[PDB]
Amino acid sequence: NVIDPWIRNNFVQAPGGEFTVSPRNAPGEILWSAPLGPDLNPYLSHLARMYNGYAGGFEVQVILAGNAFTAGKIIFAAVPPNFPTEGLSPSQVTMFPHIIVDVRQLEPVLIPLPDVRNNFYHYNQSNDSTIKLIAMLYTPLRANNAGEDVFTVSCRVLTRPSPDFDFIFLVPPTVESRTKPFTVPILTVEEMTNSRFPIPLEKLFTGPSGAFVVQPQNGRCTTDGVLLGTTQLSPVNICTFRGDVTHIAGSRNYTMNLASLNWNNYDPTEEIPAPLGTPDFVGKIQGVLTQTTKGDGSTRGHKATVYTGSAPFTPKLGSVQFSTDTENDFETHQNTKFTPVGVIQDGSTTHRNEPQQWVLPSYSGRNVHNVHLAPAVAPTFPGEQLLFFRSTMPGCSGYPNMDLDCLLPQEWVQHFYQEAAPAQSDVALLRFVNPDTGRVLFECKLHKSGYVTVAHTGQHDLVIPPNGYFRFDSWVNQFYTLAPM
Amino acid sequence: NVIDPWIRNNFVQAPGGEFTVSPRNAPGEILWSAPLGPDLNPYLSHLARMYNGYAGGFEVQVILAGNAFTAGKIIFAAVPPNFPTEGLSPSQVTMFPHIIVDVRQLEPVLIPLPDVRNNFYHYNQSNDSTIKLIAMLYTPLRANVFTVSCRVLTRPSPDFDFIFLVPPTVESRTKPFTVPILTVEEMTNSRFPIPLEKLFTGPSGAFVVQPQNGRCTTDGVLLGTTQLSPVNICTFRGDVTHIAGSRNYTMNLASLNWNNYDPTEEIPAPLGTPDFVGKIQGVLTQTTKGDGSTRGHKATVYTGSAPFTPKLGSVQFSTDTENDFETHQNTKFTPVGVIQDGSTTHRNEPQQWVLPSYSGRNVHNVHLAPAVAPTFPGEQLLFFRSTMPGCSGYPNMDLDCLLPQEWVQHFYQEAAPAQSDVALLRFVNPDTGRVLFECKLHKSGYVTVAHTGQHDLVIPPNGYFRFDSWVNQFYTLAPM
Amino acid sequence: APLGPDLNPYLSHLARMYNGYAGGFEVQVILAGNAFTAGKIIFAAVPPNFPTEGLSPSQVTMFPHIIVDVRQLEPVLIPLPDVRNNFYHYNQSNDSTIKLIAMLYTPLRANNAGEDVFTVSCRVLTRPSPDFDFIFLVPPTVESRTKPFTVPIL
Amino acid sequence: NVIDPWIRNNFVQAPGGEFTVSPRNAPGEILWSAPLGPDLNPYLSHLARMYNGYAGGFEVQVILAGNAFTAGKIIFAAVPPNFPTEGLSPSQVTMFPHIIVDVRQLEPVLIPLPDVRNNFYHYNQSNDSTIKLIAMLYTPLRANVFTVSCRVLTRPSPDFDFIFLVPPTVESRTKPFTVPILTVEEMTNSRFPIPLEKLFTGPSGAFVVQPQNGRCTTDGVLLGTTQLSPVNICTFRGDVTHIAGSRNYTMNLASLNWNNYDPTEEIPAPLGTPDFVGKIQGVLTQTTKGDGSTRGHKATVYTGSAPFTPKLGSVQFSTDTENDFETHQNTKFTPVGVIQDGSTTHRNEPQQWVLPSYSGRNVHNVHLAPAVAPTFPGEQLLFFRSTMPGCSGYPNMDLDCLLPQEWVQHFYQEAAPAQSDVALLRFVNPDTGRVLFECKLHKSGYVTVAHTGQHDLVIPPNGYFRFDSWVNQFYTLAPM
Amino acid sequence: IPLPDVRNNFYHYNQSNDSTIKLIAMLYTPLRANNAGEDVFTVSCRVLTRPSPDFDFIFLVPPTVESRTKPFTVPIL
């Protein structure tokens, strides 16, 4: 009545019906499901969305492709939809309407699919609907040949409208624009950099969330790209210092009005805990302080030391002390720049003590507490353990606390800023598929709040294949339990 | 062969059916354009997405709404498609097929629309119609506030049908070349881990421009000494050897992961080495492999030195100490700022346009990514101006790189093969929403602009870059 | 392949002496394959200006088409529905109707101990349709031939 | 499409068709409830087992039997399904669709039962009907012993039929989690072969609870140092080595079958070793490998000693003799009773919450089954209180284990994967037929109870445990 | 305004929450009323409904219109 005959007298590839079989497969187990309905044909989908009324049945053709060596007989059938199908014996699937196909059948065959004749105008959108489709292997598939994983049989499904098909009601259609697919970068963790210090990461870590009070301020942003914490985007701006030193006339120290990445003067009047790229934990770190003369550009370099637990360290106010190996070389009010590389253990007897990563620094000095805190993290679904990024800073003089566990990868932040994706539910599902094996080694549990955890117990330096990408899949709920590794 | 009869017999409203007709409008001027065709009846438009061509006509209708207090006349007509309608009197409009209307009418009114059944297949991807509908203020309608409104109603002809069954358009799309939305102040140098401060243009004849850090394909194959992590550029990891009395350290190189480096690969160097001759005060850094006692002391590297041989596997570092860094430890050179400890020359180093000694001065750097120049003449290249730090002396700190380091990783995630040679990328400042400059980004992986001389490109640091399409290799920019 | 009267040598030589032209065709096809290699193949039709670059094999369902298994020993025939917008084509125009598409549906796991083995040959056959004709008569052309631009092979 | 006509035309008796109507019954009270549907006509009920849904109605009939000496009135009616019928006057009953009957009637009487043909599929697994039939004592029927009886007769509607063909329900059932019907006085400790004497609750913060004997999956994979045979816990089998003058014996360990133990496996220890630091007087026992002359002498083991290294393969035993047990014989430590030969501390040992030295004090116990605690808060764990013997001294003999050793083997024979996390297990004393306490058994393999403080759970020793179903992870017990 | 059209033909409780699609009064264009007056002609919006022609009742109960329990009043301190 209303459809052109090239649809009503043909077949069409499934939108998603794609499944293989294997000698590693076993009889009785499920293979492939589908809810039957008008959603199974792309042509009927697009020529259905513009309509509302709905009636009729379908027909399903099927086709395989198999060699002559592998022997197997296969089975599809129909089922009422609420029926629990978990560990059904293959022999009892006799009683449903069904057909058997041999695997070496070279020619396409068609499912019967008897109509219930309780049509009475379905509401054209309801997932609570009629028959589901079942894919199942009847026979053990002895499949004996000298090849390896060999003759993995492909399978396709075709649909067709029934002759008693129709639509009933007319309506202007919808526009339906589309969102972001929640892509993540596919690097190795050892390739991505630390987000609380400008160093590449080394390995993935997990451990109990009750062990430390975990709230840093570098590496804090939304899951859709609005600037939070003391976090900025350029990773070299983390923990560096730039500004105009004024000579304390006696010591190796200077008072420096802080400058930006591009030497813009620091504003103390923003809704921030600290300047962008401030060291967000107490430590002693020996990098190097440099200064470019504003007249000619005489590059000087002297190894410095910063003290994030010191009282003259005042980033929000606009002066931080630096103790270089030289006393007053860095001239008056020039472009003076500290770049850190590694932490030393000097001036302190304690060994493996600094930096102290789970305390907060003196941003406005020891006078005013750090304002505008991007909050701390703890697992809402209990028992699980937070995901750290353990690495090792360089150590020159002494034995410092080189264990650096950051919370975020820095490249992920710019990735998500270009994403700017609104979530579909709370907690995401990311897999470590090693593409050498094409298989998962571990999973995670990534909240929309901006932190991630796993249901694995104890401390674990996660040793991964360095060729490994990461595979986001889907959206989990707040109640899913991961499996331990 | 058949569509819905309810679609065919009755009319429907159109997305152009709206009018704000005031006396404050100027008389004799165009106030609505729309290409006629399938793109006007909406339920028909979605139903006609899937079908790829036309045979038939349409009938349109007009419905008006005003008061009995004003008096205006209004025209509708049809044109040739490519006909310029801009310089055009409202007088001469009526020579086209047309119908005038008053301001005070009740019934709907159709238009003739004279037909030649082309019986050809007006392809839906193309942008060409029979006509463009028009309206023009014929009598200027003064009265004594009020504004008049009019709408457009429509259906197809009875002798209209379709052609073919086609799958939905754009089901699969080639990576659409998502340019990052960043600014060059946010992006970093590809020859050193430093954020880019300015953007520079100039001649390629002034230098020999062939670096090796910042070289990759547009679809993601590892080229040059360019690698992924920005901090691995110009840092070193290996195993130093103690010189007996001097401040030097020859270092048997290793990987990022301190793996045993293989000199027998098809590579120019270890991935991350500097691609220029230079003297730089950095900090060599070492920790004990037993407990983890960190130590870092000011070191100087010389990439124009003969013991600097990364492709062979040794590299010289002149430190402030002489024997602090033990042999075969986690010894790691961290650069700090380029010095000018050579004579009194101003801005002599780093020699960014000469090549360093990867295999030493005996065997040249192998497997080299080639040089570039504006092959399309009349244009100048796009350099990314930097200025490296320094503690003592004034060396030539102006570092001009060619790519953003994050763009390499981003386009690796793209891994996109191109659709022509030259792309259309536009620096849009979203504060303005206006293009300061466009460019000619080539599918080899470099970019050129038709601007004259030396210019540090002063741009708003909130501005992003907006890629548009794929241009042929025969377009010249207008100069700024 | 661009479909047309150019696909048959007999129809080519018995067409060049004519000018008027109408009708459709039919296409038979035949393969030749052993029993070890498993694969299912697909031909279809397309409107000619359509860009066919990276099409998913599954969406080729929607065109008129047929599936053939690779171990099919017997010849089969393409449907090829006529557009019924004939109206006397000008008998020379390359801007013309349906192109032909060759595509593999299945991954062809093809596992055997031979090397590059059972490389399947394929042939295409044509046939005039029953509603075929010519319309106009003309003295033919001589059409002598040029050099094939051979080079030495040293 | 068709059923038996003899089923359709005539009536049938129902399993609810019985009544004991006395004047001794209270007037205005409910005396029969039954959900209406397919579950009432018996031959129809079995025939309707296989079919999965309904479309139609029923007709019911009533048949009464009493004397002409009493005078009573009786009501039947229909309700909403979820409607509470408890607080309900017999007066207001009649507002529902209903029919009253006398006490003195002969003919059968049908009920209206007003219908809305739902044309939906009332799933047979679900528990929901249209109504619940009811009866109520309307007039209290005094006379001058006698009791009145009434029965229910039934058939379906003529416009009733079925839907679908389905296989018999519950053909295949997942292991139904058969809890053993034992008592904890009958079950034994999982950390020592001793029968459990009491059941204990308390905080997990008082200790660190992570043993290794008594750890397995709920579906039967070998975990911890837990093994199968209960007597192999805390006994030893290997090859002793003579210390020259002391009472000690370092024993190169073997299996249960004296097989060569492999220290290179993915195991914490040999399966059956103690998982606590302790000093215990036992009896090392040896026989000759030539004739079979048995000898057994009192020995003392120290699982907090450094030569106790089962994962390495040596273990120290301090015997009453010095050289009686020959090297590389069938030498076997049989524990007898834990002593307190350490200072004067009261209840110091066995240190049941610390871990012993499997690989010595150099390498920790590997492949460890983790610790537990009530992750669902507000609850306390379930400890199995024991008291080990002793010959000299008073050590801390209170042994709290977490599983029954026979339950591990029984659930290995189950090998059952779970259906939710938390199960519903109830200690029913069949002397009472009443639950003293329930619990929250988690599919990891441990159990918790919402009870406060320290309590030795005084229970009848004839009581068994009754598993019910699978609860979600969000239920809190009421306290005892 | 038309809404989603569904039905559950057994019933819907009607003595419960039984919550369904709530109401949206949403401002599209800020409706400036360019004139000499300030906030003049306050634009009223009424709702004046009637049931759909398929709508109907099936079951009837005694009214019991009286009251709920304690409505969980709170101090306003």
- Residue pair A72/A141 in contact (Cβ under 8 Å)? The answer is yes
- Residue pair B7/B43 in contact (Cβ under 8 Å)? The answer is yes
Listed residue (D260, D267, D325) closest to D295, CA to CA = D325
Q: Is D208 helix (H, G, I), strand (E, B) or coil?
A: coil
- Residue pair A229/A374 in contact (Cβ under 8 Å)? The answer is yes
Distance CA E7, CA A126 (A): 11
| Numbered residues of chain A with Cβ closer than 8 Å to any chain E Cβ | 123, 126
Phi, psi angle pair for C68, to nearest 5°: -130, 135
Angle at B171 between CA B166 and CA B172, to 5 degrees: 130
Helix pair angle (B405-414, A410-419), 10° resolution: 60
C-alpha neighbours within 13 Å on the C-beta side of residue B10: 7
A14/C39 CB distance under 8 A:
no
Listed residue (C49, B402, B19, D168) closest to A89, CA to CA = D168
Using an 8 Å CB-CB cutoff, list chain C residues near A153: 38
- Report which DSSP code applies to C85: -
- Which residues make beta-bridge pairs with A255? A246
B53 to chain C: closest CA residue:
C47
Distance CA D103, CA D142 (A): 12
Name the burial class of residue D44, with classes exposed (0-12), middle (13-18) and buried (19+) by CB atoms within 10 angstroms of its CB: buried
Please give, rounded to a whole number of angstroms, the shortest distance from the CA of D469 to a CA of chain A: 18
Listed residue (B25, B36, B29, B24) closest to B135, CA to CA = B29
Listed residue (D251, D345, D264) closest to D302, CA to CA = D251
Phi, psi angle pair for C59, to nearest 5°: -80, -10
Listed residue (D405, D410, D408, D438) closest to D424, CA to CA = D438
Residue A195 structure tokens? 């987000």
D160-175 burial, b at 16+ Cβ within 10 Å, e below that, comes to: bebebebeeeeeeeee
The Cβ of residue D16 has, within 10 Å, a number of other Cβ atoms equal to: 15
Among D172, D355, D420, the strongest candidate for a mutation testing the A interface, having the largest count of A CBs within 10 A, is D172
Distance CA A346, CA A400 (A): 8
Q: Is B410 helix (H, G, I), strand (E, B) or coil?
A: helix
Contacts of A56 (CB under 8 A, 6+ apart): A119, A161, A162, A164, A165, A166
Residue C92 structure tokens? 């020379």
Question: How is the beta sheet containing A58-65 ordered, strand by strand?
Answer: A12-18, A154-161, A58-65, A109-111
N-terminal to C-terminal alpha carbon distance within chain B: 56
Using an 8 Å CB-CB cutoff, list chain E residues near A126: 6
Among D88, D95, D116, D126, the strongest candidate for a mutation testing the E interface, having the largest count of E CBs within 10 A, is D116
| Numbered residues of chain B with Cβ closer than 8 Å to any chain C Cβ | 52, 119, 123, 163-167, 171-172, 174
CB pairs under 8 A between A and D: 30
C-alpha neighbours within 13 Å on the C-beta side of residue D318: 14
Listed residue (B253, B285, B283, B284) closest to B271, CA to CA = B253
Please give, rounded to a whole number of angstroms, the shortest distance from the CA of A209 to a CA of chain B: 25
Using an 8 Å CB-CB cutoff, list chain A residues near B281: 288, 299, 301
Angle at D111 between CA D107 and CA D116, to 5 degrees: 155
Distance CA D348, CA D350 (A): 7
Chain E: touching chains (3 or more CB pairs < 8 Å): A, D
- Residue pair D3/D132 in contact (Cβ under 8 Å)? The answer is no
Distance CA B231, CA A193 (A): 9
Listed residue (B303, B383, B398, B300) closest to B348, CA to CA = B398
Header resolution in angstroms: 4.1
E5/A123 CB distance under 8 A:
yes
D116/E58 CB distance under 8 A:
yes
Using an 8 Å CB-CB cutoff, list chain B residues near A183: 413
Distance CA D45, CA D13 (A): 12
A43/B165 CB distance under 8 A:
yes
- Residue pair A236/B195 in contact (Cβ under 8 Å)? The answer is yes
Residue B261 structure tokens? 């480096």
Pairing of strands D58-65, D149-156: antiparallel
Residue E60 falls in which region: left (phi positive, over 0), alpha (psi -120 to 50) or beta? beta
- Report which DSSP code applies to D18: -
Distance CA A222, CA A204 (A): 22
Phi, psi angle pair for B279, to nearest 5°: -120, 125
Query: Please, after which residues is chain D broken with C–N above 2.5 Å?
Result: 144
Distance CA A233, CA A227 (A): 9
A278-294 burial, b at 16+ Cβ within 10 Å, e below that, comes to: bbbbbbbbbbbbbbbee
Pairing of strands A73-79, A98-102: antiparallel
Contacts of A157 (CB under 8 A, 6+ apart): A13, A14, A17, A34, A40, A60, A61, A62
Q: How far from chain centre, in Å, is Cα D472?
A: 16
- Which residues make beta-bridge pairs with D249? D242, D317
DSSP assignments along C10-51, one per residue: HHHHHHHTB---B--EEEEEEEE--SS---EEEEEEE-TT--
A116/D163 CB distance under 8 A:
yes
Distance CA D287, CA D291 (A): 8
Using an 8 Å CB-CB cutoff, list chain B residues near A466: 257
Q: Is D222 helix (H, G, I), strand (E, B) or coil?
A: strand
Residue D159 structure tokens? 């416009």
Using an 8 Å CB-CB cutoff, list chain E residues near A123: 5-6
How long, in residues, is chain E? 77
Point out the residue among D80, D95, D119 whose CB comes nearest to the CB of E59.
D80
Distance CA B349, CA B394 (A): 9
Residue C118 falls in which region: left (phi positive, over 0), alpha (psi -120 to 50) or beta? left
A286 to chain B: closest CA residue:
B296
- Residue pair A452/A421 in contact (Cβ under 8 Å)? The answer is no
In order of A291, B133, B149, the CA distances from A250 in angstroms are 19, 84, 82
Token pair 């899949």 is found at A473
Distance CA B288, CA B192 (A): 28
Q: Is B232 helix (H, G, I), strand (E, B) or coil?
A: helix
Contacts of C56 (CB under 8 A, 6+ apart): B171, B172
Using an 8 Å CB-CB cutoff, list chain A residues near C105: 65, 156
N-terminal to C-terminal alpha carbon distance within chain A: 58
Peptide bond into D350 cis (omega under 30): yes
Contacts of B87 (CB under 8 A, 6+ apart): none
D166/A457 CB distance under 8 A:
no
The Cβ of residue A180 has, within 10 Å, a number of other Cβ atoms equal to: 14
- Residue pair A283/A292 in contact (Cβ under 8 Å)? The answer is no
A303 to chain B: closest CA residue:
B298
Listed residue (A243, A275, A270, A246) closest to A259, CA to CA = A243
- Which residues make beta-bridge pairs with A157? A62
Listed residue (A337, A355, A359, A338) closest to A346, CA to CA = A355
C-alpha neighbours within 13 Å on the C-beta side of residue D243: 16
Distance CA D466, CA D468 (A): 6
Among B117, B126, B164, the strongest candidate for a mutation testing the C interface, having the largest count of C CBs within 10 A, is B164
Distance CA D169, CA D51 (A): 10
Please give, rounded to a whole number of angstroms, the shortest distance from the CA of A175 to a CA of chain C: 23
Distance CA A329, CA A307 (A): 20
Residue A373 structure tokens? 């805190």
Using an 8 Å CB-CB cutoff, list chain C residues near A9: none
> Over the Cα atoms of chain C, what is R_g?
19
- Chains C and E touch each other (3 or more Cβ pairs < 8 A): no
DSSP-based helix, strand, coil % in chain E, nearest 5: 0, 0, 100
Angle at D372 between CA D371 and CA D373, to 5 degrees: 135
Structure obtained using: cryo-EM
Please give, rounded to a whole number of angstroms, the shortest distance from the CA of B270 to a CA of chain A: 16
Distance CA B277, CA A238 (A): 28
Query: What's the per-residue H, E or C state across chain A?
Result: CCCCHHHHCCCEEEEEEECCCCCCCCCCCCCCEEECCHHHCHHHHHHHHCECCCECCEEEEEEEECCCCCCCEEEEEEECCCCCCCCCCHHHHHHCCEEEEECCCCCCEEECCCCCCCCCCCCCCCCCCCCEEEEEECCCCCCCCCCCCCCCCEEEEEEEECCCCECCCECCCCCCCCCCCCCCCCCCCCCCEECCCCCECCCEEEECCCCCCCCCCCCCECCCCCECCCCCCCHHHCCCEEEEEEECCCCCCEEEEEECCCCCECCCCCCCCCCCCCCCCECEEEEEEEEECCCCCCCCEECCCEECCCCCCECCCCECCECCCCCCCCCCCCEEEEEEEECCCCCCCCCCCCCECCCCCCCECCCECCCCCCCCCCCCCCCCEEEEEEEECCCCCCCCCCEEEECCEHHHHHHHHHHCCCCCCCEEEEEEEECCCCEEEEECEEECCCCEEECCCCCEEECCCCCCCCEEEEEECCCCCCCCC
Token pair 């103390």 is found at A268
Q: How far from chain centre, in Å, is Cα D199?
A: 16
DSSP assignments along D116-172, one per residue: ----S---TTS---S-EEEEEE-S--------BEEEEEEEE-TT-B-----PPTTSS
N-terminal to C-terminal alpha carbon distance within chain C: 34
Distance CA D388, CA D188 (A): 12
C83/B174 CB distance under 8 A:
no
Contacts of D383 (CB under 8 A, 6+ apart): D199, D200, D201, D202, D400, D401, D402
Distance CA D155, CA D144 (A): 38
- Residue pair D68/D104 in contact (Cβ under 8 Å)? The answer is yes
Amino acid at E21: I
B389/A339 CB distance under 8 A:
yes
Contacts of A349 (CB under 8 A, 6+ apart): none
